[PDB]
Amino acid sequence: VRMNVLADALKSINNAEKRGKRQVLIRPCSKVIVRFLTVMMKHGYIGEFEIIDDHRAGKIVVNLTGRLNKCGVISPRFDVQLKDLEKWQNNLLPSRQFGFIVLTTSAGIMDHEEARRKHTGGKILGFFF
Amino acid sequence: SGALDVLQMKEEDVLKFLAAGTHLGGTNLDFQMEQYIYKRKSDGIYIINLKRTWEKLLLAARAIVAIENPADVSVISSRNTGQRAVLKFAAATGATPIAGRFTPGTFTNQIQAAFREPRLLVVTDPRADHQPLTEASYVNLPTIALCNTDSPLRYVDIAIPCNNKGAHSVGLMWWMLAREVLRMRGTISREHPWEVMPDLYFYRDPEEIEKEEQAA
Amino acid sequence: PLAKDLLHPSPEEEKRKHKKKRLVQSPNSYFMDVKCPGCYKITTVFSHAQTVVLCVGCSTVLCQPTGGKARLTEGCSFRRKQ
Amino acid sequence: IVKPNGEKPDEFESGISQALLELEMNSDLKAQLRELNITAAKEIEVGGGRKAIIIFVPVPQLKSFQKIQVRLVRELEKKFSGKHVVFIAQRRILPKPTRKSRTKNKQKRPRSRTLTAVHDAILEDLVFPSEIVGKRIRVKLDGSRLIKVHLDKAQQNNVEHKVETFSGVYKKLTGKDVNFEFPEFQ
Amino acid sequence: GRMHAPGKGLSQSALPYRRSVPTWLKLTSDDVKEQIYKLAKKGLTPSQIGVILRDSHGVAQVRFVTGNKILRILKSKGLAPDLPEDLYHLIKKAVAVRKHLERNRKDKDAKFRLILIESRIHRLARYYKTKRVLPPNWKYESSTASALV
Amino acid sequence: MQNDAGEFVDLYVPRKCSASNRIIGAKDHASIQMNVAEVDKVTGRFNGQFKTYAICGAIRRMGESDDSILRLAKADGIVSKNF
RNA sequence: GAGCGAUU
RNA sequence: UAAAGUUGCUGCAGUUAAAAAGCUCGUAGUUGGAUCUCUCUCGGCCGAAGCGUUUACUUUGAAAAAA
Ligand SMILES: [Mg+2]
Ligand SMILES: [Mg+2]
Ligand SMILES: [Mg+2]
Ligand SMILES: [Mg+2]
Ligand SMILES: [Mg+2]
Ligand SMILES: [Mg+2]
Ligand SMILES: [Mg+2]
Ligand SMILES: [Mg+2]
Ligand SMILES: [Mg+2]
Ligand SMILES: [Mg+2]
Ligand SMILES: [Mg+2]
Ligand SMILES: [Mg+2]
Ligand SMILES: [Mg+2]
Ligand SMILES: [Mg+2]
Q1: Which positions carry Phosphoserine (chain E)?
Q2: How far is the CA of A9 from the C1' of H12 (A)?
Q3: Is there a domain that residue B3 lies in?
Q4: Residue B105, CA: closest nucleotide via C1'?
């Protein structure tokens, strides 16, 4: 059965990005997925997306810009303290000049740099670069 | 044609296309040749949209005119039906013709006698001129092809959806391409019909040669 | 291929897909008003009926169920609703 | 005819109640408006000079109101100067339960008493003559949202001129930007 | 895929997007409820009641008309069976297979299918115990099964 | 690209595919840089101006350069809108 | 020209 | 001990090099689809009292032998 929805959405986006497609359809939708896509779009990696509202769980159509190298999910969602973040940055990101780790904190869903600015930890969801 | 009225297709061109049968395709359809098709009638024959054919022909002409030296364009035909048309196109336009066999290594083996470095390539059939198409990918060579309903589009940049089986259709396509190139260059005019008729580009079919020889 | 508007499929594209694989689900069935020649009552019948529908007034078999759709008795007329 | 929850009526509510009494006396819908009543009314400015009246009616009478909706709207628009009159039900909003929430959580909050449910009900009742066939949400590059609502084609001519006042009313009440479209067919 | 079969079919129903009752339907909620009560008193399960309403009376979805589901309407009225219909059907099928199998000792396939059916029965019974629909002592026993249904 | 002082520090800036936005490398010999001529709207002759497109070899091997060139020409107004 | 390669 | 990504949580393998149980059921274990934006009283705005349906998480603070 399907047990992770963000994993399927990110895998579909990555596969469509490898093939040079212009748009991706991901179903089902989820507010976690919407937050993750918003974080990706704020940094210019995807572009505008539209939420198709059927009466059951919704769908998303996402535009692609060709700037995405890799987007992935981390399972299970490990608890990350503010002093252990640099280890995850070294393990997962390609360089220290670009790339983002996505965390769910009590303040909201954000990237690792915004979590350093707000001085909070949380649980790791995924990464993209 | 950027919706310009001067570049629109006229009635005489439509009549020529209908007489030559360029709108008739095969029974098989390629999955990347489906945007140029109109509808499949009975007996399985696919019909080609002539407006999209005209648009693609004009785009190919614009690509050809953009090259400064006319000799940098190479026109290649392997089947006998296209050899005379390619020779006439080269004579009228100034390109370099390759009729008959294409020698492997022409674009890659620089010590051969026939080594050439064209800037553009025009072929009559992707499935029959596949060898010149493959060597284009080795030397950064754009390609123009006269494709059909069932034709692979690998390494083809501008595909002109015509009928490349009949001799009349191939000759008419080459003649119209030459006419459009010359009119865009500013050599012949668009106000009067071209002096040369499209029958000069047709395949002789030496049976017809023998029949005409014994006419008188 | 590499260029397709997923937001705006053509009307013929969405009637060719599976009913669940469309952008928004929509059944292929409908309700119809049927009238038998003997009796004047109009009966509402589901297209993919699974039971024999009898006319209440005159006990006439309006339709017979089959694998996909229910076939109307000879001489009965029907019109789709809405 | 006006029975506010706060028991404090105003001038516009009084005028609309007088108009409802006039319709009771001079029209053929005596029993309907005699049994029915309204809670409140408001007026807003939309479309660069146009004005819209909102009639907040109780929920247990909304279905009965919908029976006469069209005729009542016509009569009201003929009695008043050129405006746009819309009838909307009165939905309660309960705050989301929290750890610091007090004994206001002695009963589980009904799903109908929810911000999203109330917003959907308001959107459905706002365009009542036309049914809602589809909904799309577009997230702009700057993060803002736009709601596109597809309406029925069979009732296009009835409400085609009221789209702008609908987008104004929803923005004034809900606080979101919404647009309306009429797709060809399914 | 199936719980106890390798098949992976996709056949099911697709409800329309609109939840509003169609204009042509003249029936009220009370008339639909009375029809449901009469059909239940005739001795029909909620599934059969829904099928009859869909086929004959043009009632596409009772929950759209009356605002409530068939089983909840029956429970409010009090005309509801003691045990759920799906569990009843599973137990009846198990009883039928067991009655066949006693006269045919060499039918190994019947034994395999009976094991599968009883596994499904145990799953459903545990689920219904969790929801307190069944008392936390109800047990499926082969001897008692004939009297149960 | 550039250091903290803002001075640009690179050998060269590679060009990207117009279809897929991928970087066209130095050893990509299946890439094409094509020019399409512009005509005068009154006469229809060669203006002397052209529009440049670049397609990487990956798209060309996919057989998707035809559609990409067609869409690029439509976007630039070279191809008629009612194509 | 084809194979990481022996090689073809 | 590193080299050993040859014990692999990070981070290995299981068609042919070592390797997936003959097949199915099934308890424990592991994993699990969408959805919901502080409070009266009593005393001097604060003080007492109930908080929180409770946790997990994260950020603080206190207590934490030296070497
Ligand atoms: Mg199973
Ligand atoms: Mg089935
Ligand atoms: Mg060699
Ligand atoms: Mg080599
Ligand atoms: Mg060691
Ligand atoms: Mg190591
Ligand atoms: Mg590592
Ligand atoms: Mg090993
Ligand atoms: Mg082995
Ligand atoms: Mg095996
Ligand atoms: Mg278990
Ligand atoms: Mg969940
Ligand atoms: Mg110590
Ligand atoms: Mg110490």
Answers
A1: 29
A2: 28
A3: no
A4: G1
Question: Does residue C78 contact residue C72 with C-beta atoms inside 8 Å?
Answer: yes
Q: Are the C-beta atoms of residues B41 and B29 closer than 8 Å to each other?
A: no
Yes or no: say if D135 and D178 are a contact pair by the CB < 8 Å rule: no
Q: Where are the domains of chain C?
A: 1-82
| CA closest to E2 among chain A residues | A1
A4 and A54 inside one domain:
yes
Distance CA D135, CA A4 (A): 26
> Residue positions of C in the annotated binding site for Zn(2+)?
36, 39, 55, 58
Residues of the domain holding A122: 69-129
Dihedral, A11, A13, A18, A23 alpha carbons, nearest 10: 150
Report the residue of chain D nearest A47, measured CA to CA: D141
Question: How many independent structural domains does chain B possess?
Answer: 1
Distance E10 CA to H22 C1' (A): 31
DSSP state of D147: E
Q: Under 8 Å CB-to-CB from A14, ≥6 apart: which residues?
A: A68, A70, A71, A72
Number of domains in chain A: 2
Q: Which residue has the tokens 């670069």?
A: A129
Residue with token string 């050893």 = F27
Kind and range of the H or E run holding B46: strand B46-48
Question: Residue B128: is it exposed, middle or buried by C-beta count within 10 angstroms (0-12/13-18/19+)?
Answer: middle
A54: nearest CB among C6, C7, C24:
C24
Question: Between the CA of B118 and the C1' of G7, what is the distance in angstroms?
Answer: 34
**Phi and psi torsions of F27, nearest 5°:** -105, 15
Quick check: A53 and D134 CB within 8 A?
Answer: yes
Between chains, do C2 and A50 touch, taking CB under 8 Å as contact?
no
* E9-CA/H56-C1' distance, Å: 40
The answer to whether B107 and B137 are in contact (CB under 8 A) is: no
Contacts by residues D28-32 (CB-CB < 8 Å, ≥ 24 positions apart): D29/D68, D29/D71, D29/D72, D32/D64, D32/D67, D32/D68
User: Which residues of C carry a binding-site annotation?
Assistant: 36, 39, 55, 58
> Contact, F83 vs B54, CB < 8 A?
no
- Mark whether E51 and E93 lie in a shared domain: no
Tell me which method was used to determine the 3D structure.
Answer: cryo-EM
> For chain G, which bases have at least one atom within 7 A of a protein Cβ?
1
Range of the domain at E44: 26-80
Whether residue A80 sits in one domain with residue A122: yes
Range of the domain at B44: 13-216
Residues A62, A8 share a domain: yes
Structural domain includes residue B201? yes
Number of domains in chain E: 2
Query: Contact, F2 vs F19, CB < 8 A?
Result: no
Cα(E29)–Cα(E37) distance, rounded to whole angstroms?
A: 12
Consecutive H or E run containing A72: strand A71-73
CA–CA distances in Å: residue B6 to residues B16, B186, D139: 19, 14, 43
Q: What is the stated resolution of the deposited model, in angstroms?
A: 2.8
Q: In what order do the strands lie in the sheet with C53-54?
A: C53-54, C61-64, C71-72
Q: Which ligand is nearest to the CA of A2?
A: 12
Which residues in chain A have Cβ-Cβ distances shorter than 8 Å to D141? Answer: 41, 47-48
Looking at D2-61, list the stretches that DSSP marks H as alpha helix, in order from N- to C-terminal side: 11-26, 30-35
Nearest CA in chain C to D186: C11
CB B153 within 8 A of CB B30: yes
| Strand H atom within 7 Å of D110 CB | no
Kind of pairing between the strands at B73-77 and B96-99: parallel
D99 touches strand H (CB under 7 A): yes
- The encoded tokens of residue B154 equal 């690998």
Please tell me the number of the ligand nearest to residue E126's CA: 11
Pairwise CA distance, residues A53 & C7, whole Å: 12
